[PDB]
Design a protein around this nucleic acid. Structure first.
Ligand code: K
Ligand code: K
Ligand code: K
Ligand code: K
Ligand code: K
Ligand code: K
Ligand code: K
Ligand code: K
Ligand code: K
Ligand code: K
Ligand code: K
Ligand code: MG
Ligand code: MG
Ligand code: MG
Ligand code: MG
Ligand code: MG
Ligand code: MG
Ligand code: MG
Ligand code: MG
Ligand code: MG
Ligand code: MG
Ligand code: MG
Ligand code: MG
Ligand code: MG
Ligand code: MG
Ligand code: MG
Ligand code: MG
Ligand code: MG
Ligand code: MG
Ligand code: MG
Ligand code: MG
Ligand code: MG
Ligand code: MG
Ligand code: MG
Ligand code: MG
Ligand code: MG
Ligand code: MG
Ligand code: MG
Ligand code: MG
Ligand code: MG
Ligand code: MG
Ligand code: MG
Ligand code: MG
Ligand code: MG
Ligand code: MG
Ligand code: MG
Lengths: 116, 135, 52, 78, 177
RNA sequence: AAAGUA
RNA sequence: CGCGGGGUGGAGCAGCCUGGUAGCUCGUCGGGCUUACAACCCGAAGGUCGUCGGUUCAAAUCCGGCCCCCGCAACCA
RNA sequence: CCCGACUUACCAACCCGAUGCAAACUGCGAAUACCGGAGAAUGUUAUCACGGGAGACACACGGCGGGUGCUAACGUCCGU
RNA sequence: CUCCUCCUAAAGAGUAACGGAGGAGCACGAAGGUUGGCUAAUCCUGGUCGGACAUCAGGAGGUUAGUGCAAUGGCAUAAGCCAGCUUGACUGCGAGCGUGACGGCGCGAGCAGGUGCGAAAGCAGGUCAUAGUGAUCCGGUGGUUCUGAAUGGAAGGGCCAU
RNA sequence: UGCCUGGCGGCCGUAGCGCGGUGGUCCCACCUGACCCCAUGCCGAACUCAGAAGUGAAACGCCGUAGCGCCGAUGGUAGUGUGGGGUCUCCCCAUGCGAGAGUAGGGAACUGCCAGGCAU
């Protein structure tokens, strides 16, 4: 199963981040959409979030499942995080390769101001 | 003469023999010979009693042996002083009170009683005749 | 105990050396590794030589 | 005759050195073990021989956590 | 491509009418075609494996993968990791082109050919057949062969049983006996 | 040079 | 009993050490020389290695028992 | 000839059901003992550290838990 | 006769016998570091040579595999399998702790300098761990801002590495 | 406010299997192409990218159902600390602690944060 394989792929880094007590920037990717959440060190409270299923973000995109959409989501999540005053997170690729849409989101968040 | 076909280890600690038995019900036949005492049953004894039983019933019915001699017993040869554990010489089953040792089926109760008495005369432990119970 | 002792000698000319072992029958090629030289306080190339 | 046995190795003094609720200083060994019968929790490290040791001052806490019902040792800050 | 279009344009409706499927996604599909050569003589001369791989590459239009022993076997004098075979996996356009070539050219050229067995199904709708001589493939020149070589062909199908697998294969006019 | 027996 | 060494074509003996089908001499069989036999010449066959277990992908081989044989030792009062 | 067709004095692996055994078995698991914290009473500080002086390092039997021996020894070797 | 693993050993440690069983006196510049990826045995069915067992495909199964070498404790976030880049198998130190009669032996965050892998958080002071060993003396080799029997040197000595 | 879905957790079988049914507006999944970023020790299978014609078939989620797994008393039994006793290899008495297995029975999880869709 693809989902179980990816969860297995992500577990080691997630356990390391929990042990380090870091604030996570977790990314989730589907063929149609991309999502980003900033999660508190306890792992059960979401501080900010942004995705292409939000109207305010999706209305400005030709397609919600490509690198341009990924960059828009990264920029939006970084701006909301900076508005909340977070500024310091660790990237959680969630078992996806650091590449393509995931990398474009991360680069947009870095450019917008998140430190990771 | 029963004895394990193979074992993990050749020799065993003496140990002890406390407690009451597990396996106190006639489970396979209709009649049983049950131990009332505590002790060891050698393979030779088990087989001497089996022979006595079987000849008494004229090889009719069915007989189960509920105990198996899985404990090896070592001895030191004569005129030896230490120097390592002795050699395995025979095999025993440890018996606690309540242990059903043999069961019989397919024969009348009187004949089973006679056969079991002849068998018990070969054994070093006191025994008693039991019958199957519904519960 | 077929493995033989060898030294790895700094290329920085300081005389500093590390020591280790090597299976000379299976790997005749000289061992070469970048290691920290505490005399010049830099990582440099170190090359195999006889143990003495 | 003679015996082919007669050998043994020295006892390794493994086991739990600090039990639940004990106050420890950072660095203290909590358990010595072969492999991870106990696992490292919060503020605990696992050394190269799988010794669990305190990474902060505090009180020893044992718990059972996770999907495998594994045993973890952590240090509660005091 | 021709056989893929034939599938999508006749076989889907044929199978839907035959088996009363409620969804087009339920129709059996040709997942992949795998060609294998068990070159057990390479342990004496590895160059034989090279020749077999060249033949497989010529037959399939694809670079083959050398397959090694999973474990040491005393009976065949092979140690674990010994290269003893070569395989090719065909999907998509390459699969369809090879399927068409095999159906329309190579199979009729089989020596004493009288139809393929319909019992060569593994129970889950996948088909396996054995080609005794590679010369049946026109991509192999009969004059330059140094040694006759066979192979195994497996057609892996998304069918759920042998009946659906054979129906799908026969919809392409597979030369069953 | 080496050739026993019936 | 203790310490060693062994057991492999019909006989005597190699190979074992150090894991990947094992050989020599005599003997046997078929042919040849002879009136015939012997001697001699040519050709061929014959053992999964004492018996079991274990290790090993694989054991004549390494390890552990069991049987048989040989050589030393089994003593002081 | 390739096949095959029956039958077992039969032996029966795997699996299913039922019955036991284990120092070097454990999908369970005590009593005690041990480590740590808190509290009262009691106890000639009974505790720890440093320093002056030693003796001792052949132990015995009895109870309990055991190895060995024959669940032999006023036997032998540990634990308490 | 030293070392390692199990049991005896009485659910903390330790615990004897000419008690019961097995191993070591190494191996590896990758079999070490790191990043990314992956998941076993066995059986059934179909398939050229190919057979009980080679490679191929599917299914069952779920670690019954694997671990450089004994045994125990571990291991899926794998410590098991594959590949890229590499030298942290770094140098100076070290809060604190374990274990020893002692000589000693072990675990260790963190600090300074310099380094590898990673986008990054980070990881790396050898290897899944526990055997693979030998005090002191006497000398050998290299280094050295130490010493240098009147003085300058030198010899010899010290210190550091071996 | 309710229903549905996705992500991250708590918890770690009363929560997992099996069997039956059911869902596509959205979401998810399969899916459509691949010259390209990237990739196959062969293969766009996987990874990756560009998309949205089709389908809920598979997967997933939800609902139902004890054939299993799982949980599980009360009582009794085993063992056992201390003191006493016997016919002392083994037991009994007073007191304190008290299983394991099995029985009755339970049982088709519960829950926090954020986001989206629909009704309202
Ligand atoms: K199929
Ligand atoms: K005793
Ligand atoms: K005593
Ligand atoms: K113990
Ligand atoms: K490596
Ligand atoms: K590597
Ligand atoms: K010390
Ligand atoms: K000097
Ligand atoms: K002078
Ligand atoms: K000098
Ligand atoms: K359930
Ligand atoms: Mg006992
Ligand atoms: Mg018992
Ligand atoms: Mg030990
Ligand atoms: Mg004569
Ligand atoms: Mg004399
Ligand atoms: Mg206390
Ligand atoms: Mg003394
Ligand atoms: Mg003494
Ligand atoms: Mg004494
Ligand atoms: Mg004493
Ligand atoms: Mg006693
Ligand atoms: Mg007296
Ligand atoms: Mg005495
Ligand atoms: Mg006595
Ligand atoms: Mg203990
Ligand atoms: Mg104890
Ligand atoms: Mg003592
Ligand atoms: Mg002592
Ligand atoms: Mg001892
Ligand atoms: Mg030895
Ligand atoms: Mg990794
Ligand atoms: Mg200190
Ligand atoms: Mg630094
Ligand atoms: Mg970098
Ligand atoms: Mg080292
Ligand atoms: Mg390794
Ligand atoms: Mg190791
Ligand atoms: Mg001298
Ligand atoms: Mg002078
Ligand atoms: Mg001078
Ligand atoms: Mg795709
Ligand atoms: Mg469905
Ligand atoms: Mg009760
Ligand atoms: Mg209970
Ligand atoms: Mg369910």
């Amino acid at each position: 199963d693809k989902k179980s394989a990816r969860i297995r792929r992500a577990t080691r880094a997630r356990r390391k981040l929990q042990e380090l007590g870091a604030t996570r920037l977790v990314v989730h990717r589907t063929p149609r959409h991309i999502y980003a959440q900033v999660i508190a060190p306890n792992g059960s409270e979401v501080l900010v979030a942004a995705s292409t299923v939000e109207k305010a973000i999706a209305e400005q995109l030709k397609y919600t499942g490509n690198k341009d959409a990924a960059a828009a989501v990264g920029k939006a999540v970084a701006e909301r995080a900076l508005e909340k005053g977070i500024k310091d997170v660790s990237f959680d690729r969630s078992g996806f390769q650091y590449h393509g849409r995931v990398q474009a989101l991360a680069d947009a968040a870095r450019e917008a101001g998140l430190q990771f | 003469m029963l004895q394990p076909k193979r074992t993990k280890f050749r020799k065993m600690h003496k140990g002890r023999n406390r407690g009451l038995a597990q396996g106190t019900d006639v489970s396979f036949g209709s009649f049983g010979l049950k131990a009332v005492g505590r002790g060891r049953l050698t393979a030779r004894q088990i087989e001497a009693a089996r022979r006595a039983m079987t000849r008494a019933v004229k090889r009719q019915g069915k007989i189960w042996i509920r105990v198996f001699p899985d404990k090896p017993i070592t001895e030191k040869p004569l005129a030896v002083r230490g120097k390592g554990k002795g050699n395995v010489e025979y095999w025993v089953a440890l018996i606690q009170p309540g242990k059903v040792l043999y069961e019989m089926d397919g024969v009348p109760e009187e004949l089973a009683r006679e056969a079991f008495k002849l068998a018990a005369a070969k054994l070093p432990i006191k025994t008693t005749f039991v019958t199957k119970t519904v519960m | 105990g077929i493995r033989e002792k060898i030294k790895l000698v700094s290329s920085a000319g300081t005389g500093h050396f590390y020591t280790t072992t090597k299976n000379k029958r299976t790997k005749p090629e000289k061992l070469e590794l970048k290691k920290f030289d505490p005399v010049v306080r830099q990582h440099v190339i170190y090359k195999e030589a006889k143990i003495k | 005759g003679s015996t082919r046995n007669g050998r043994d190795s020295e006892a390794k003094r493994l086991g739990v050195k600090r039990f639940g609720g004990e106050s420890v200083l950072a660095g203290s060994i909590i358990v010595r073990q072969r492999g991870t019968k106990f696992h490292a929790g919060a503020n605990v490290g696992c050394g190269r021989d799988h010794t669990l040791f305190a990474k902060a001052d505090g009180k020893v806490k044992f718990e059972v956590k996770g999907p495998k019902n594994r045993k973890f040792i952590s240090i509660e800050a005091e | 491509a021709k056989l893929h279009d034939y599938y999508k344009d006749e076989v889907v409706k044929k199978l839907m009418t035959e088996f009363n499927y409620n969804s087009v996604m339920q129709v059996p599909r040709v997942e992949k075609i795998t060609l294998n050569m068990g070159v057990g003589e390479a342990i004496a001369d590895k160059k034989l494996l090279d020749n077999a791989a060249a033949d497989l590459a010529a037959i399939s239009g694809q670079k083959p993968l050398i397959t090694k022993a999973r474990k040491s076997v005393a009976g065949f004098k092979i140690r674990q990791g010994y290269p003893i075979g070569c395989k090719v996996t065909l999907r998509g356009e390459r699969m369809w082109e090879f399927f068409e070539r095999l159906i329309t050219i190579a199979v009729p050229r089989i020596r004493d050919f009288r139809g393929l067995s319909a019992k060569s199904f593994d129970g889950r709708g996948n088909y396996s057949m054995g080609v005794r001589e590679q010369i049946i493939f026109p991509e192999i020149d009969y004059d330059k062969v140094d040694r006759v070589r066979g192979l195994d062909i497996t057609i892996t199908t998304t069918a759920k049983s042998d009946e659906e697998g054979r129906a799908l294969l026969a919809a392409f006019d597979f030369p069953f006996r």
